[PDB]
Amino acid sequence: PAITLENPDIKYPLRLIDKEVVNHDTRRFRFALPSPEHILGLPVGQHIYLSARIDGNLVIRPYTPVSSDDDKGFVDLVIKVYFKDTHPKFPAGGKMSQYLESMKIGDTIEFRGPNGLLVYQGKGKFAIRPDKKSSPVIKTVKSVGMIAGGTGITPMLQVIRAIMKDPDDHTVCHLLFANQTEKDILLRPELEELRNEHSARFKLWYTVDRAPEAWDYSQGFVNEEMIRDHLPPPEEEPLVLMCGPPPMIQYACLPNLERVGHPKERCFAF
Numbered sequence: 001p002a003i004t005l006e007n008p009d010i011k012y013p014l015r016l017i018d019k020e021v022v023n024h025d026t027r028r029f030r031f032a033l034p035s036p037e038h039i040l041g042l043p044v045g046q047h048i049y050l051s052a053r054i055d056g057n058l059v060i061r062p063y064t065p066v067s068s069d070d071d072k073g074f075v076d077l078v079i080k081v082y083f084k085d086t087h088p089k090f091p092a093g094g095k096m097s098q099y100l101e102s103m104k105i106g107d108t109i110e111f112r113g114p115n116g117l118l119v120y121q122g123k124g125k126f127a128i129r130p131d132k133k134s135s136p137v138i139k140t141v142k143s144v145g146m147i148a149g150g151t152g153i154t155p156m157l158q159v160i161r162a163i164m165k166d167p168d169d170h171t172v173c174h175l176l177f178a179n180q181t182e183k184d185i186l187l188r189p190e191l192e193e194l195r196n197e198h199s200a201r202f203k204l205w206y207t208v209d210r211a212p213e214a215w216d217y218s219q220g221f222v223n224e225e226m227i228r229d230h231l232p233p234p235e236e237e238p239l240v241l242m243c244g245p246p247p248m249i250q251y252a253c254l255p256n257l258e259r260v261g262h263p264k265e266r267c268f269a270f
């Protein structure tokens, strides 16, 4: 079937056809593809850019849809945390989130894609480019560590879903999901608890700052112990995606990942 993203340098206006208020503080935006039998065309591991003129300036931000190339005619559903202005946090809120929230059904928005240095090829082979030209981490076949904070869950869910979808893919996924409170745990239902259907290959653990009264998981951040009990050990030569919580990629990779001995070449930040 016809691809929407036929050229990565071209921008594609897509119409907004639906908007669900989920409310983790979230929305789900559904956009129409050129037609009912189109798919988006986004390789697993890759993202899209949405770009708009907001308050007279060009703004651009990356998003990993929640729909898949299995979806058809909308193959694009995006899940959005909205950063409201006039809240705890800094005056004007966030530029793109607030704009999407403002859109009206039928408004269009520009999609550009695919973007990204990592592509999942299936059965554990990861095609990663460094500076230029991809090299397969052909073997992994077996195991991947994922550390997500807040909106960093999306790139992770994309890969988790791709693996579980393949009954013959034996790659085991270990997810460490960090958030400030049990409240911003984005996509919790939205089958994260898909652990229920695949725990032989899917290992889920949460950490939060502020833990509720009878929390069953972890609290606070990283230590290094956390990484130890919840991600595959170095000895297994796994691949590590989004090292600390995606938030402002700081620290270089994780100081905690080095500590347990994970090679910095096997740590990828989306």
Ligand SMILES: Cc1cc2nc3c(=O)[nH]c(=O)nc-3n(C[C@H](O)[C@H](O)[C@H](O)COP(=O)(O)OP(=O)(O)OC[C@@H]3O[C@@H](n4cnc5c(N)ncnc54)[C@H](O)[C@@H]3O)c2cc1C
Pocket (backbone or CB within 6 Å): 047, 060, 061, 062, 063, 064, 065, 078, 079, 080, 081, 082, 083, 084, 085, 087, 088, 089, 090, 092, 093, 094, 095, 096, 097, 098, 151, 152, 154, 155, 270
């Ligand atoms: C690969 C990738 C995939 C992503 N996928 C998604 C996705 O699927 N869904 C998604 O929602 N995001 C995703 N993001 C996050 C990305 O920043 C978005 O474009 C997001 O919408 C942030 O942008 P903004 O323009 O609204 O905020 P900006 O205008 O960039 O504001 C930055 C903000 O500063 C802080 N801030 C501003 N206002 C507030 C507030 N009220 N409270 C707290 N902090 C505040 C927050 O740190 C926030 O990031 C992704 C990022 C990457 C790299």
